[PDB]
Amino acid sequence: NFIWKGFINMPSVAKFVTKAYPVSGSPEYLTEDLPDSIQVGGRISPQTVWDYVEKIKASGTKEICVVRFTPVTEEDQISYTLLFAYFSSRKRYGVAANNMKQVKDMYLIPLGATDKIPHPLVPFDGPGLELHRPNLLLGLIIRQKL
């Protein structure tokens, strides 16, 4: 019941195969809307994302969904961890640079195992996350509405 399997690729940092699972919002059509390899093009301050997400919700023109990434093999898990640490240590989110037509924005969020969920994502409208969990990379996906 993963909705997409593909690479995350941050040049000079980490590249790995991952499966995405739904967390919040409708994951419908994500299999067609995500590229084979999500290219991480840069980094962004979390407050900038949350200010933007507030405007997105106010505008009523987009759908927000949240997925969680899991490494596929033990080798993937080493690089997944490097990427988590990259953004966690710098208190940044990642920015996808090769979005497909239906996705306006995609951010990669490190969520520490003992972290509180960022408030603009609560409440989760979907399976959510387990209380007892590893360090995780989430994807925050802004999609166009019909």
Binding site: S12, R43, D51, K55
Partner: peptide
């Protein structure tokens, strides 16, 4: 209405 995406800090060489 349609908010413009925020700028960010590019990382990739």
């Amino acid at each position: 209405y349609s908010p413009t995406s925020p700028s960010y800090s590019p990382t990739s060489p």
